[PDB]
């Protein structure tokens, strides 16, 4: 369900707007219903529709790839391609379908320390577009500070769900608030056994020590599910490419035998990770080598 | 002044922290000294590394390309390389240099509607890091009044924390959030003037037959920021002849279908937004093939290696 079909599906909801209503997921994993004043609930709907338009609709360079094929792209809304739904994904699913006559309302004596996340439900063309912002008290002034409880809606979303297909804006909320996306740590070490069974690296320990920092653990799961080099082109062709390469030879070294790579230092680990993401590309026009941070296939 | 040279210019100010001073800028373009509470000032100080280390120091995938070589990279600090300082750059330059004995303090009867931006001066190692932020319209400060509803009671409370917008480490400034620069500081005059230079150079290049579709997209700063990039950092315009690009597109496996050549053979056909966006990506050399896997790729964010 492509970038354009998203732009159709969202602008169907935005133009034939039917109703907004806000749900609190709490620490007890129950969806409690808000009591927002009308001109303040009109205050929520106007600015979200602009942010929805700014991020999706008339946004030209919107890019929707798979979450396992993560990289560092601005704008962009990542497709949830995994199968393990964190429980808050399913809480948003039940948040879509509270009946409108229900009275399980949020009691405001709880001082918004119960509020774990804020669910914005924007409905239109009979469907509903749910958005998610985690409870972020942040900081407000007046000079002194008195709230420490007062709710905050910064018109911003991390997670949103159109139908049965979830999309990702801020990747960090999907880990540090959602299960550390612990599939990633397991997907990183399935790749570490696959690098072990590739026998391309001599010592696998420095790669095993980068799997603690989650900034490398995403890059391992990228190569685990989406590599065009691991398991597809053989070991000796990779080594002969790196040796003949102009930039890659000075950093990655091959052992005395010539059959195993020497990836021990962090400077060599970052570049070898960018080797198995195929991020060392060349133009047929300018004949210049390049280092890709964000890229996409073309013949599909 | 590279990425690592930014990283240790910051962690020199960071690991020898001296004092944090908060300056409000007005709509009268006069700087105003805040009155931050002491336990608030420590909670406002927050470390700030808690944001700054995660953007700079501990951030391994930190990238510092020029602002004029814009692309869509996250965890990225765009080095300001233009000649023109928008007036808040010059107000941040004076924001560093208020003497600490000065009594030009901010009067809080203004209800924070004169407040246009928020300057976080973070000083250390006798230098000063300065952060910039805009006063946005309070987001929503919804509070209670059992039967309790919710309402934006004050509608004047200053809402501020991290997610900074603009640097001032030395004179080489950096941009994290670029929309702040183009809209609140009014930088989009300089991008659109640079983009019109690009349209006249393509007109002189004679690679396209009609240029009107590029000029209808030139108002949207999305195309103008890609036109201002190609005006200043393309490895194709003027360096290679127009015919060689045409035989390369005519030979191509993807570009041959979208971008066409006229019936004569010397001019490219760029009219619809599809053929504009793909020729824009052709122009900044974003179509690259692997020397290993031999798969053609379309790059969003890239970097040279030879330099």
UniProtKB/Swiss-Prot annotation, chain A:
The keyword Disulfide bond does not apply. One of its GO terms (biological process) is defense response to virus. The keyword Nucleotide-binding does not apply. Keywords: Antiviral defense. Disulfide bonds: none annotated. Pfam families: KwaB. Disruption phenotype: Cannot be deleted in a Kiwa-containing strain of E.coli. Component of antiviral defense system Kiwa, composed of KwaA and KwaB. Expression of Kiwa in E.coli (strain MG1655) confers resistance to phages lambda and SECphi18. This is Kiwa protein KwaB. It comes from Escherichia coli O55:H7 (strain RM12579 / EPEC).
Curated annotation (Swiss-Prot), chain B:
Keywords: Antiviral defense. It comes from the Bacteria. The keyword Aminoacyl-tRNA synthetase does not apply. One of its GO terms (biological process) is defense response to virus. The keyword Metal-binding does not apply. Pfam families: KwaB (PF16162). Disruption phenotype: Cannot be deleted in a Kiwa-containing strain of E.coli. Component of antiviral defense system Kiwa, composed of KwaA and KwaB. Expression of Kiwa in E.coli (strain MG1655) confers resistance to phages lambda and SECphi18. NCBIfam families: KwaB (NF041623). This is Kiwa protein KwaB. It comes from Escherichia coli O55:H7 (strain RM12579 / EPEC). The lineage of its organism: Bacteria, Pseudomonadati, Pseudomonadota, Gammaproteobacteria, Enterobacterales.
